[model samples]
Target chain A: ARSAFSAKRSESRVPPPSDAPLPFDRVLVNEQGHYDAVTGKFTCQVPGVYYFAVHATVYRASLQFDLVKNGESIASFFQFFGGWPKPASLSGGAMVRLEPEDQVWVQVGVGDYIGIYASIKTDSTFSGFLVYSDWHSSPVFAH
Target chain B: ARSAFSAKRSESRVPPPSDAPLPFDRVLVNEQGHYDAVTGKFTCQVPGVYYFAVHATVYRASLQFDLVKNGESIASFFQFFGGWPKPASLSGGAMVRLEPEDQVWVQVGVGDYIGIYASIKTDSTFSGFLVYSDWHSSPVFAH
Candidate 1:
């Protein structure tokens, strides 16, 4: 009941541009309205320990993906799938202590292929959840 | 404490027969002793809403990966990688309401290639944690 979400990229939606915010247009659970699939961003509402994960399908070329937190590239991953119809999975996860209004999202790196994809049989997903809220213990940053 | 775990596959381990629980032998965190690395399964102790994620290396051929919940195939994913020296990533995630003693694991479908791997430069991971406990949702109380 705090904050949580699970979403996947849309299959038919073409990628807009490189190095922009990669969108996750399909959702399974967005309990707290934290994940804005329309803008491809997750805005933290609760100050807590949260876990975020990304799994992408790399098709037709190489992919340089980054997990952006507060406009910084906190973590990045790479993948290469040679030949057409050859798609592979790239996965990354992080546990972060977040403050209210912090932003998080996935994006491709500049000059990297925007070949992250989705389909009926295979899925590329992004997810996160609040593990424990810090409101009870800390006094200075009271909401 | 609440339940949570994250693990990766061992570099030197070999895959067992098809449809067996894909083992994640390396432990990053096991907060509640719920994930049995010996058996490669996560058994829920706290009944609640939880999130599970898996990232796999798809090398040498196609992969049929599944997220197994209590012995059933709740969600499945596919991947294909061409050529040697070029491994790709496959990722799957889900949010499920789990009861106590509920088991979750990953498995390959029958006749699929057993090419999921990990190394120094790359990783294949499985992670999960409790988001909220159902006991707090109702009138029953315990501390």
Candidate 2:
């Protein structure tokens, strides 16, 4: 598959600083080089239905973020914790139809920032892949 | 593309106990015999990368379940409600690489047996389909 990407946080094991883009600089798969580890974004290279998933770990108080598409908020996932010493995990996903060059990323929403908990053992991850292409067709000539 | 299946509870709106398969005795789509509504099991016919999803409604206290692959637990999703008159919905998914004849299904998990609230309006659902196959080839040799 030419349009696929999966990444997780690398150096920063804590929540992102302020309302910043979560730096998922560690890439496990980037079939088409659509995901930029340094820039923390994925630009669409194919126009079709795509599946995107977000899995994050949250500390105390609250966890909030938006799955931004082309600088606009398309979907959001949040969790509210009662007190400290009790951590939780939240995950969400969406299937979207996109055109070429559309940008997508995860942005911290509110509060100090919902830290996507990570360690050498486990890391928060984001992934996406093409589900279908509009131009898919059968070959016209035999090989 | 032809190997696809999706189904929702048509009737039998009840929840199973721990270690029991959640009965989804309804059928919306079953392209092949991969999913059996009677036993609530999906036995793989053609192996590849398959995407499976589940959505269930929690009544009163909590809802917990596991998506199993060949009797091995692959993933689980759960929700805990505080009291009566307050219900919640939980959904989760996983993509697995399967071989032919591998079985897949959903089963109720531990803790005060989470009721999978279902009716004509809100029915628990389970669905799956093949994403990619190694045996796939272009249809250029058609006579």
Candidate 3:
């Protein structure tokens, strides 16, 4: 057993007012109390290989963002409307090993496109958990 | 140790002839004898909490499918291409606890849209691994 958490937007058709702090306001689970709703980040509380994932809805515009680790972008996903008449969701994830105190969160790219269209049912989501700790002499990150 | 597996399509611009089975012709990693390229399925060798992910490419059509467990639909993802000139990828995942003998695989929807484009690099992929077993009072499934 190790640290794990999940959060998602709580409203419908709502985009973050600004790009800096994306609110995943609904807490689905936060096993180790490592997720901060105010900051929309998960701080590593344990040293191990962890798995992280994000799924968010997109509108007529494009959406781009990076999954940041200690201020460094590790994984990212990008998608655009491309004349699609309706909205869609984009998701991406990564598995990385971390030391204690490492912070993880999503930072939207500059532009009005760094927003999402969501509802309570299909709200944008972020989730992650520790995968293993004893598999190696030390934990290692992977793409 | 823990069981893990990842597989992807080897060829580019090839689609499964039919929807009965989705073939991930390349095996990137098979740490345990869990994934079968021949049958296109992963047989659970260990009873534990597991995370499964799917990432696939789509063109000017639609795609729909399910992550099946023991022939039962556990989780599903769906998307459509609406007059877009370019191709895009859709991704989703789930975490579930399983018992030994539980088989998992991606079953394409029964239609023309169930096809996928692939290459050595960005081919449609399926991956999963054991996460935690003893942390929960009871095993459960999550999207």
**Residue B133 error, candidate 2, Å:** 2.3
**Higher-scoring candidate on lDDT, 2 or 3:** 3
Q: Tell me the lDDT of model 1 at B92.
A: 82
- Chain A only, candidate 2, TM-score: 0.84
Top model number, TM-score: 1
Runs off by more than 4 Å, candidate 2:
A1-47, A53-60, A70-72, A79-103, A112-127, A134-143, B10-17, B136-143
A1-143 per-residue lDDT for model 3 (tens digits): 47777676666445574556566777756646788988888898778888889876676678887788987788877877665755566887898888889998877865756646554223466778887663465447632
Clashing pairs in 1: A89-B89, A89-B90, A90-B89
| Ten-residue region with minimum lDDT total, candidate 3 chain A | A115-124
Give TM-score, chain B, model 1.
0.89
Instruction: Give the candidate order by descending lDDT.
Output: 1, 3, 2
TM-score against native, each model: 0.72, 0.70, 0.66
RMSD value for candidate 3: 6.3
What is the docking quality class of candidate 3?
A: incorrect
lDDT of each: 0.78, 0.69, 0.71
* lDDT winner: 1
Query: If the candidates were sorted by their TM-score against the true structure, best first, what order would they fall in?
Result: 1, 2, 3
DockQ of 3: 0.19
Pairwise DockQ winner, candidates 1 and 2: 1
Error of 2 at B46 (Å): 2.1
